[PDB]
Amino acid sequence: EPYLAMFGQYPDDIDGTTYNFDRCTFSGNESKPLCVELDANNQPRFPEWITIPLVCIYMLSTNILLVNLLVAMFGYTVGSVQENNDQVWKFQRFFLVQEY
Amino acid sequence: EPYLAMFGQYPDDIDGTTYNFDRCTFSGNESKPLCVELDANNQPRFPEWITIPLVCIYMLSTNILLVNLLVAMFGYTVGSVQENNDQVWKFQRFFLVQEY
Ligand SMILES: CC(C)CCC[C@@H](C)[C@H]1CC[C@H]2[C@@H]3CC=C4C[C@@H](OC(=O)CCC(=O)O)CC[C@]4(C)[C@H]3CC[C@]12C
Ligand SMILES: CC(C)CCC[C@@H](C)[C@H]1CC[C@H]2[C@@H]3CC=C4C[C@@H](OC(=O)CCC(=O)O)CC[C@]4(C)[C@H]3CC[C@]12C
Numbered sequence: 001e002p003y004l005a006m007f008g009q010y011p012d013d014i015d016g017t018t019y020n021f022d023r024c025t026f027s028g029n030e031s032k033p034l035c036v037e038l039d040a041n042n043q044p045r046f047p048e049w050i051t052i053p054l055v056c057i058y059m060l061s062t063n064i065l066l067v068n069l070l071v072a073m074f075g076y077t078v079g080s081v082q083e084n085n086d087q088v089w090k091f092q093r094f095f096l097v098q099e100y
Numbered sequence: 101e102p103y104l105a106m107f108g109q110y111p112d113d114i115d116g117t118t119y120n121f122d123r124c125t126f127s128g129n130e131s132k133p134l135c136v137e138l139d140a141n142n143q144p145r146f147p148e149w150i151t152i153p154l155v156c157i158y159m160l161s162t163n164i165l166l167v168n169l170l171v172a173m174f175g176y177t178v179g180s181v182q183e184n185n186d187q188v189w190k191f192q193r194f195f196l197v198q199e200y
Contacts, residue, residue: 017131072174
C-alpha cells in the first residue's frame with residue numbers, strides 16, 4: 001500500500017471520516033484488511049493529527065522529494081558519460097559485426 | 101485539500117454540477133465539510149466562471165510550473181556540487197573508519 005502511493009494512491013479511505021462500513025473485518029476473515037482499533041464509543045482510535053501529516057510527509061518525500069531527485073541524478077549521468085558511451089557503443093559495435 | 105491537489109486531486113466534486121446529495125451538512129454535524137452557500141432557488145451560489153479557472157491556474161502552477169521547476173533546481177545542484185561532494189564524502193569517510 002505505500003508502494004502504490006508513489007504512483008498516486010494517498011491513503012484512499014483509511015485516514016479519517018471513512019468509517020467501518022466496508023473494507024474491513026474485525027475478525028480475520030475475509031481477505032479484507034482488518035479494521036481500525038476502536039473504543040467503547042466505537043470510534044476510530046488513531047489520533048488523525050498524526051496519521052494525516054505522516055502520509056502527507058511520505059507523499060511529499062517519495063512522490064516529489066525522491067522521484068524528481070532521480071531525474072537530476074539521471075540528468076548528471078547523461079551529462080557525464082555521454083562522450084564515453086560513444087566509445088563504448090563503438091566498442092561493442094565490433095562484436096555485433098563479428099557475429100556473422 | 102489543496103495539498104492533495106499537488107499529487108492529483110483537482111477539486112473532485114465541489115467545482116460544479118455536483119449538488120448537495122451527500123458530502124455536506126448545512127449544519128456543522130457530522131464531520132463532513134459543510135455545504136455550498138445557497139439561494140431562494142437552492143442553487144449553488146459560487147459563480148463557476150471564477151472557481152473553475154482558479155483551480156485550473158492552481159493545478160497548473162503547483163503541479164507543473166512548480167514541481168518541474170524543482171527538477172531544474174535539483175538538476176543544477178548535481179551539476180554544481182558533484183566534484184565538491186567527492187571531497188566531502190572522502191572527508192567524512194575518515195570518521196566512519198575512525199569509529200573502530
Ligand atoms: C508545510 C506544508 C507544505 C505541509 C502541509 C501540512 C498539512 C498537510 C497538514 C499539517 C497539519 C495537518 C492538520 C493537523 C491536525 C487536524 C485535525 C484533525 O482532527 C482532529 O484531530 C480533531 C481534534 C479536535 O479538534 O478536537 C483532522 C486533520 C487536521 C485538520 C490536519 C489537516 C492537514 C494538515 C494541515
Ligand atoms: C490557457 C489554457 C492553458 C488554460 C485553460 C483555461 C480553462 C481551463 C478555463 C478558462 C475559462 C473557463 C470556462 C469559463 C466559464 C465557463 C462557464 C461556466 O458556467 C457558467 O458560469 C454559466 C454562465 C452562463 O452561461 O449563463 C462553467 C465553466 C466554464 C465552461 C469554464 C470552463 C474552463 C475554462 C475554459
